Amino acid sequence: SFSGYLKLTDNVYIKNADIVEEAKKVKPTVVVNAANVYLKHGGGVAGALNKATNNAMQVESDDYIATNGPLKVGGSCVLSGHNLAKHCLHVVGPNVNKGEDIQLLKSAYENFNQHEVLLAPLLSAGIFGADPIHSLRVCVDTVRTNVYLAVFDKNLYDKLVSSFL
Numbered sequence: 001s002f003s004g005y006l007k008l009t010d011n012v013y014i015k016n017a018d019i020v021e022e023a024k025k026v027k028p029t030v031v032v033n034a035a036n037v038y039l040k041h042g043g044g045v046a047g048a049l050n051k052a053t054n055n056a057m058q059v060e061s062d063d064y065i066a067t068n069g070p071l072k073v074g075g076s077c078v079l080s081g082h083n084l085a086k087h088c089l090h091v092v093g094p095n096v097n098k099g100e101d102i103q104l105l106k107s108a109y110e111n112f113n114q115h116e117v118l119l120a121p122l123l124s125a126g127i128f129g130a131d132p133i134h135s136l137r138v139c140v141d142t143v144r145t146n147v148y149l150a151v152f153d154k155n156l157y158d159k160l161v162s163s164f165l
């Protein structure tokens with residue numbers, strides 16, 4: 001199961017880890033992708049997860065969009081986890097660098113409540129432009145199911161733990 005995580009709350013855990021390496025080791029039921037509405041997995045966590053699947057995540061995602069159209073900011077869809085997990089929950093947090101409303105971050109984290117346990121990144125963090133400290137606060141105050149947060153950057157991980165209320 002998940003190992004080496006620091007316990008933040010009754011249901012939220014955190015670790016300084018590369019989510020691709022973590023997913024390959026644990027093979028969780030659900031890995032969360034930091035998706036955009038088009039499921040174009042070019043960079044950030046999405047680019048990394050898609051590269052680990054040898055682009056199979058992108059081929060599946062393009063068929064999903066061709067059939068269903070784009071997701072909503074704050075929405076999600078469940079697709080295959082390929083070689084990383086049973087399922088991938090593609091969640092769209094607001095991208096501050098595209099001028100999207102940070103208030104949609106709580107709606108994005110509500111998608112996690114449909115799954116009993118998840119391996120996830122902090123939504124809207126990294127190249128999505130939000131404050132990761134804020135994202136962790138919204139995560140703890142919204143998600144009720146068991147969430148294992150992987151934070152790639154060691155310096156950010158230390159800042160998140162040391163400033164956690």
Ligand SMILES: CN1CCOc2cccc(NC(=O)Nc3cnc4[nH]ncc4c3)c21
Binds near residue numbers: 024
């Ligand atoms: C190095 N690993 C181990 C297993 O083999 C593969 C295969 C594909 C990708 C990676 N990891 C990766 O790209 N990680 C990555 C990058 N940028 C990122 N930005 N934000 C998160 C985040 C994660 C790995």
